[PDB]
């Protein structure tokens, strides 16, 4: 029981990176309650997106979410050096329960 994410992804500075988060019709595909977290090495996780494509305050406009079917995604557009980090998704999966993805390490070329 984990959501599927690519282990790693790279992009050039100023370009975009997209990270997918694939589950099933019982979680990612069944609800609009996908969240994304950014974690720099040895630091606490930052909430970047909730409810598929809502941003907390302080998250730049260049981070966005989308979802189609059983796959949600996070795009980091206008890639900056500080965007190098591990990124995790999560979903609601029914009955007051949540499930996390396995994480993607994003590097800048
Ligand atoms: O500042 C904020 O906006 C802020 C927002 C935060 N959002 N946290 C989350 C984390 C996950 C979700 S979610 O995509 O799972 N959505 C939901 C929605 C309703 C019930 C359960 N889950 C929803 C909100 C958490 C802390 C904060 O400070």
Numbering used by the authors: 2 to 110
Give the authors' words.
Our work focuses on a λ patient-derived VL homo-dimer named Mcg whose structure and properties were detailed in pioneering studies by Edmundson and coworkers. VLs exist in equilibrium between homo-dimers and amyloid-prone monomers. Likewise, mutations that stabilize the structure of VLs or covalently fix VL dimers inhibit formation of amyloid fibrils.
Crystals of the complex belong to space group P21212 with two symmetry-related ligands bound per Mcg dimer, and thus one ligand bound per VL in the asymmetric unit. The crystal structure shows that each of the sulfasalazine ligands occupy all three A-B-C-sites simultaneously; each ligand binds to the A and B-sites on one of the VLs composing the dimer, while C-site binding is on the symmetry-related VL. This contrasts with methylene blue, which is bound only to the A-site. The crystal structure of Mcg with sulfasalazine explains why only one disassociation constant for specific binding was measured. Therefore, the equivalence of the two sulfasalazine ligands in the crystal explains why only one disassociation constant was measured by means of equilibrium dialysis.
